[model samples]
Target: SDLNNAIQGILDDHVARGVVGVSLALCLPGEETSLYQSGYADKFNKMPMTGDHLFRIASCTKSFIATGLHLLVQDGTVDLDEPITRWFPDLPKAAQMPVRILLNHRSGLPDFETSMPMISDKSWTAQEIVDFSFRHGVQKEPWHGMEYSNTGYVLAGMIIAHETGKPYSDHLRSRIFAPLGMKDTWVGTHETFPIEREARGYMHAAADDENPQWDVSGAGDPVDGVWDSTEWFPLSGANAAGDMVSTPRDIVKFLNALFDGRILDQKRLWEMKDNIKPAFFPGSNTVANGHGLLLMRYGSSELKGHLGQIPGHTSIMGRDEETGAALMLIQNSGAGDFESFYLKGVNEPVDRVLEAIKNSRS
Candidate 1:
């Protein structure tokens, strides 16, 4: 059970370094998902972390939003190649890009995430944040390539709302979550993940000190060097791009089904990978961004999924093609250097496991 030990070691390392907890799940083809955990869901009371504990899975929600959009496309309700201006004529500046570009993040929309404080005391309405990005700036021409902008996703969700006459989460609930039995996931800021087993998030003084008046200082109490950031930033602001809460178990279940073609049909799934190319991201040199998922090469394996990082939570989840394995890593800590934050806590472990799977499967 070297794989089990590897998972334990990774989780233990994070918790030892002041992470509140870590939860992981790995699923290989024809095998039941194996769950592992280290550290405490409640660090003060010493509640044991488990696969059922929920974490704020930030941008990984992008994959879900993209999948929902594709579902609409498959139903002939929307066209990916068509310009998004149809739904958002008011903000023609941000909507000029095609719906497809918005999904893949080539929409030229400025990032509202960097514009705001690391954490916020006030809730940012979805349109408020999207409008903030437009006011921040727009690169109408440069976005034909690639740009990592959360505003693009917020716009995507807005279009979904317009097309379906319901929140995008409704489609996700019906098409993805219900079909796959993902009972632990929540979106649209409709409700907090109310389960008592939800993991409390932690962040070091640095992330809190960024804007003492507006950030975690307003939302959390300092316990030693780290602050409790359980729900520092309102999920409403994160909206479509990063607003999601789910457990490690539920995450891998979704990944397992998506990778196995049980969630998206082949046609739309193909669209997810069709225009994928190199991404200008860290962690992986050959990182590929499709309509929603990030495809990356590690060792002899290729993974399809997304990375999530919010106020006090960090997560990485996806499936590997070579070994037919899916990996889920969620940490209740946001305490890494921003320059290469994920390169350490998130990508390294992912790289190690995918390597392990490749060598073992071979």
Candidate 2:
């Protein structure tokens, strides 16, 4: 009862502060599960938010890609320490970077998503993004330091493609989504979202506007002031880095499967968990990095997952390694500063839920 009340209080406060909608799921393995949604999925249309509605999980896609690679490693198809140059020898600098460095964001590649222009009539390919980054130059030498870069994952995706002779999405569907029975999940693109079930995202333009502008097609909307961005971001540019979409329950199920060793062998999984490095991002606090996942702590509890933002949506998904507890939070509106609102409002509540679960077990 206290857990429900506390969680509801957080959602209610966020709604009052202009958050369009919030969908959350809290799961404890072999014990109990809870799902909560509030506000509106389509605010303009008065559509109520539901747990089944899909949200762009953004960078959370990285963990799935990493898992796919681990599956390949288990099969003796890819080597973590092997140089990437074996596949794409064109970029000799990146060739020297090992595959494991790519997985953990230590490849020292610049983030093409941030450096490149967001507005374009043309859709972008993974190779194009990687090429653009190479033209700009690498941020640092390989294994020099940990820096967040989607470009490395794009290259990693290309490696997957070269190895399997199939698109990264194909491998993800067959190897990860279908096997996990994640029927509600898919690798989504700008051209191919199930519009009927996907939540329409929004962003705050100004105080005087009649309504918050639609994230997908609203005119005068830019990711910042430089480039025009719409719903196309997740599909067009994010590609293998952050293009997956799923419901809250499906996300929790995927996390459970990954942590329980269904997706990767214990040896590979432990390698993923143990190969740690410091990661810095523009957010609430400092966190650690491990093969495509961010390591975070709240009180004594530890979580391994990633936070994602694309256009008008923001998401946080993570699991407690010690207790098999997991939570997912997705907000339809990508308004407000990350540290001020999202971390305090969106993330803190989920942390409370996990704490409550731990207390219940005690």
Candidate 3:
């Protein structure tokens, strides 16, 4: 299978780059079997990176948050047009924008961390992030169009937390993870998750040096003291936005659950899929944009998925919408071609997989 060759190529690249390890998984819809596992989990310990190895998904968690939001709408618990202020009364009347606008990222709120103090050794609460939501005046106008706003998603998650009277993490666990049988997936910040298999993230200190960090806060030092995992967590937040962790195989299950109508129903799934749009044109060779997840068009077909880069890890997961074939890759080191880093490795394998599927169907 081209998929196999592609996977091998990516694994070879991992070795060439001196990466400690990687985990990968690919599943085709209606197919009972899928590709799984390659490389090491921890180079220092000689641990093999398995399909079950958990990795920090970062903003890729946004899709989960979006799903929860759609679920709330499906049950009539909330309206997409209703202002989020209905849940967070402290939100200034001026800050209220239609829920869908926020989901689509048209909310005018500036980046949530713009006014946020550098995360330090103390833990911050969700309330603080909620307050910071409006701290930066609207940098872009409401419904002005597509702009990636993490603040909007954070606010959306806070809304769900406020209305349900449960922490956002609990809601996600019960609403999504538990139901999908994603046993290893979890939200919230843990210094070191005791999961049996996990990928350790590594950061490049200098062009020649790589350092492994334990938490997101430690990684913040390189980015001008912007992000710190210690003070953030519930405050930096996770909701209908991002910050969940899982294995490559588990993410495949998530996409399967989504498209299989096992999670959000057919109608809601279509709504989410329709939200895909190009964010920018990346030269003649690449077309870049974000839908609900980051998306790409190849020939007549469109692929849907998300790409995430936290401090030390970079990941991409998506499926061919036309064929229902899915692929995901997680790397321990964050280096080279930031956007294509994840997608290219995964796409190389995915293109082969999809081509095989096409030939079989033909």
Winning model by TM-score: 1
**Cα lDDT, model 1, residue 82:** 84
Stretches of candidate 3 above 4 Å error? 1-6, 33-35, 89-96, 113-120, 133-138, 189-196, 205-240, 280-291, 298-301, 335-362
* lDDT of each residue in 114-227, candidate 1, tens digit only: 556666656776789877877875655636677677888888888888888887788788888888888999983655568476798877665433332223334446677677
Using TM-score as the measure, name the better of candidate 1 and candidate 3.
1
- lDDT (C-alpha, whole model) for all candidates: 0.75, 0.74, 0.60
Residue-level error in angstroms, candidate 3, position 67: 0.7
Best-first order by TM-score: 1, 2, 3
Judging by lDDT, tell me the better candidate of 1 and 2.
1
Question: Which pairs of residues collide in candidate 2?
Answer: 190-235
* TM-scores for all predictions: 0.90, 0.88, 0.79
Cα deviation of 75, candidate 2, in Å? 1.3
For 1-362, candidate 2 gives per-residue lDDT tens digits of: 87678777777777777777889888867756588888988876789999989988888889888888888898898999998889877775856788888888778887666555433455778888777777764578888787787887888888888888988888888898888888888887423657678887765553333332222342454432212123545375777788888988899888888888888888888767767888876653337888878887777787788887765577888888888888888887764344435333456666666677777678
| lDDT by residue for model 3 (1-362), tens | 66456556656665465555567777765665464555666655667776767887866787777787778788788787777667665565434587776666656666654344433444555566556555643666676766667767777677677667776677778888888788878774422344455576654444422222223333446442112122223323433455677878788888878877888877678767765444532211124333255565555555677766555566777777787777676776553233333323434434544565566566
The local lDDT score (0 to 100) that residue 294 gets in candidate 2 is 86
Between candidates 2 and 3, name the one with more favorable lDDT. Answer: 2
Candidate ranking under lDDT, highest first, comes to 1, 2, 3
TM-score for candidate 1: 0.90
What lDDT is obtained when candidate 1 is compared to the true structure?
A: 0.75
TM-score of candidate 3 to 2 decimals: 0.79
lDDT of 3 at 357: 59
